[PDB]
């Protein structure tokens, strides 16, 4: 019922493609991969990173608070 031939109505659209044996599999891989990755990470880093930053701060604070919770209070054994 839902196969190729009856998916959508498309008019006046031209597509050009070439054979995979005709073109390279890695056309300028590093020289255009690096700026594209940098663009994607600079468009998403402010939405993604600060929650995990404050997870790191909460994790370190909780671990150190537990460590000083196990620490001996020097105020005890001071009266006698």
């Amino acid at each position: 019922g839902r196969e190729f031939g009856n998916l959508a109505r498309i008019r006046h659209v031209i597509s050009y493609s070439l054979s995979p044996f005709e073109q390279r599999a890695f056309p300028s891989y590093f020289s255009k991969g690096i700026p594209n990755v940098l663009r994607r990470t600079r468009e998403r880093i402010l939405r993604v990173a600060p929650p995990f930053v404050v997870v790191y701060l909460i994790y370190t604070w909780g671990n150190q608070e537990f460590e000083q919770s196990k620490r001996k209070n020097p105020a005890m054994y001071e009266n006698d």
Partner: protein
Amino acid sequence: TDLTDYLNRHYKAPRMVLAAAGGVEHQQLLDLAQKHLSSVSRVYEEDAVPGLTPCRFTGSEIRHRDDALPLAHVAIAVEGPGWANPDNV
């Protein structure tokens, strides 16, 4: 002027054939070609002779989608050998 340049470049006499088929005599046709078709150009006028260049075949695809048409036409081809290669036959 573009038509004049094309006409003076590509209508050379060595690249021309006067062909006749049917009720014709070859000697009469040769005499008529000597009378009328002699001295067309024969000279490229700058010693600038064009050269035929081989064409690169590319395995590729063009898809013109227009869904309002009632029927679809699809052509699939590979590279042919050329005129002078006998395996054409």
